Amino acid sequence: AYTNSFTRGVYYPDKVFRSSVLHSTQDLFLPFFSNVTWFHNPVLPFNDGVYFASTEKSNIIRGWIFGTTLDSKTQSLLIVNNATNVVIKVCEFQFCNDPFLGVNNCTFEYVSFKNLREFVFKNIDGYFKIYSKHTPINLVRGLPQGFSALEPLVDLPIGINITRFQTLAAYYVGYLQPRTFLLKYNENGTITDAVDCALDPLSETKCTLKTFTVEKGIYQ
Amino acid sequence: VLSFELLHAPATVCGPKKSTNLVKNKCVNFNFNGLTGTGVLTESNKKFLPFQQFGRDIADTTDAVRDPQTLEILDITPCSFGGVSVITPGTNTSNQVA
Amino acid sequence: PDPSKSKRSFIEDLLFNKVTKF
Amino acid sequence: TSNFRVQPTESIVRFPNITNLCPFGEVFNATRFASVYAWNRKRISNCVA
Amino acid sequence: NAQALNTLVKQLSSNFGAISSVLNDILSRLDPPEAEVQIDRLITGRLQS
Numbered sequence: 001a002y003t004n005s006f007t008r009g010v011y012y013p014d015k016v017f018r019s020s021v022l023h024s025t026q027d028l029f030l031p032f033f034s035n036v037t038w039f040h041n042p043v044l045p046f047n048d049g050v051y052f053a054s055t056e057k058s059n060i061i062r063g064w065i066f067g068t069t070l071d072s073k074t075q076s077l078l079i080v081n082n083a084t085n086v087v088i089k090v091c092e093f094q095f096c097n098d099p100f101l102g103v104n105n106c107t108f109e110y111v112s113f114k115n116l117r118e119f120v121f122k123n124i125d126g127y128f129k130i131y132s133k134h135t136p137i138n139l140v141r142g143l144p145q146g147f148s149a150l151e152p153l154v155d156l157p158i159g160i161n162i163t164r165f166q167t168l169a170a171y172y173v174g175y176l177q178p179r180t181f182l183l184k185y186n187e188n189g190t191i192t193d194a195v196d197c198a199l200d201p202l203s204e205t206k207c208t209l210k211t212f213t214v215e216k217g218i219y220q
Numbered sequence: 221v222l223s224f225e226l227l228h229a230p231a232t233v234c235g236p237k238k239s240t241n242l243v244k245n246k247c248v249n250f251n252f253n254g255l256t257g258t259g260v261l262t263e264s265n266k267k268f269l270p271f272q273q274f275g276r277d278i279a280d281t282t283d284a285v286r287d288p289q290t291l292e293i294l295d296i297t298p299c300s301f302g303g304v305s306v307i308t309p310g311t312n313t314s315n316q317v318a
Numbered sequence: 319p320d321p322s323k324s325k326r327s328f329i330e331d332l333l334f335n336k337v338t339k340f
Numbered sequence: 341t342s343n344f345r346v347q348p349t350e351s352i353v354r355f356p357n358i359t360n361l362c363p364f365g366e367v368f369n370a371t372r373f374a375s376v377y378a379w380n381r382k383r384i385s386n387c388v389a
Numbered sequence: 390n391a392q393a394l395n396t397l398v399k400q401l402s403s404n405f406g407a408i409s410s411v412l413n414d415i416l417s418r419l420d421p422p423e424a425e426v427q428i429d430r431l432i433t434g435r436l437q438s
Binding site (some may be wrong): 247 | 342343345347348352354355358389
C-alpha cells in the first residue's frame with residue numbers, strides 16, 4: 001500500500017545560518033509527491049538513506065536497528081527511546097522476530113494521531129547522521145499537506161555497514177535520492193519553503209532562475 | 221602505567237581546543253572551530269538555530285559566527301579597505317600632493 | 319522641480335522609485 | 341597608486357570549552373591497589389586530557 | 390551589472406581542479422612545493438575569471 005509524500009522530507013543540509021535568501025544544494029533527499037509505503041511492520045531495505053515518519057500520540061515506537069546482518073557477525077546499530085530522550089549502542093545481537101523481548105562485542109554507546117514525528121537516517125561515509133521533526137496534526141492517517149524541515153540530532157562516529165533496518169499510530173517509509181533542491185530561508189535563519197528541481201518543468205524553471213516566482217515568457 | 225592507543229574509532233579524549241580571549245569592534249585575525257579569517261568582529265541579533273555554527277550573505281561570503289565558548293552570535297565585517305589615489309597638479313608647476 | 323524636497327520633478331521621482339560582496 | 345587595508349591588530353582563536361577534569365585523581369590519590377600479576381585496568385574515556 | 394559582479398564573486402569558491410578553493414586549506418595542509426601547484430591552479434582559475 002502507498003501514500004503521497006506531498007512536500008515532506010526536507011532537512012537542513014549544513015550547519016549554516018542564511019536569511020531572507022534562496023540557496024541551492026544537491027544531496028540525498030526525499031522527492032516531492034513520491035509514493036511512501038503505508039503501514040500501521042517488517043524488516044526493510046535502507047537503500048542510500050531512509051525517511052521514516054509516524055502519527056504519534058504517546059511515543060509508542062520503542063526504537064530501531066540498522067546494519068548488514070541485524071543478526072551478529074558485526075556490531076549492528078541499535079537505537080532506543082526513553083520518554084523524550086534516546087539511548088544508542090552498536091551490538092552483535094542475534095535475536096528472533098521479537099528483539100523488544102530479547103533486549104554484544106560493543107564498540108560505541110551514547111545517551112541523549114495527535115502528532116506527526118518525522119526522521120531521516122543517513123550514512124555519509126564520513127560517518128552516520130540523524131535528522132528529526134515533531135509537530136501536531138489533524139487526526140487523519142494519511143500525511144497532511146504542509147511544510148517544515150527536519151533538524152539534526154546526532155553524528156554517530158561508528159563506521160558500521162548498513163543495507164537494512166527494523167523497528168522496535170499509522171507510519172510511513174520512503175527513500176532518499178541524489179537530487180538538486182532550492183531552499184528558502186526567512187529572517188530568523190529558518191528553511192521555510194522549497195522546490196524539488198526535477199519535479200516538473202515549472203519547478204525546473206524556478207531552479208534555473210534561482211527564484212520562486214516566474215514572469216511570463218520562454219526560458220531555456 | 222598509562223597506555224595510549226589509536227584506532228579507527230573517533231577519539232573522545234583530546235584536551236587541545238586552542239583558544240584565546242575574544243575581541244570585539246577592532247580589525248582582528250580570527251579562527252572559530254577551524255573557520256579562519258580576518259575582519260572586524262561585532263555583536264549581532266541574528267537568530268542562529270541551535271545547530272547552526274556559521275552565517276553567510278547573498279554572495280556566499282561569511283557574515284556571522286557562533287562563539288563556541290558562549291551564546292554569542294557575532295557578525296563579521298570585512299577589514300576596512302579601499303584604493304588610494306593621489307591628486308596632483310603637474311610636477312612642472314608644483315610638487316604638492318593630496 | 320519641486321523646491322520643497324533632492325529637488326527633482328514629480329515624474330523624475332517616479333523614475334527614481336521604479337528602478338530598483340567586498 | 342596603492343590599496344589601503346586596515347591590518348589585523350591582534351589574533352583570536354575559539355573552540356568549545358573542554359574544561360572538564362578527567363577522572364585521574366581517583367587513581368593517584370588512591371590508598372589500595374592490587375598485585376603486579378592481578379593488575380586492574382580502569383577504562384577512561386569521555387574527558388579532557 | 391549585478392549578475393556580472395555576483396558571478397565574479399561566486400567564481401572565488403570554484404575549485405578549477407585544485408584540491409580546495411579555500412586558500413587557507415592549501416596553505417595549512419600542503420608543504421610549499423605541492424602548495425605552489427595547487428595555488429597556481431587557483432590563480433589560473435581566478436585570473437581567467
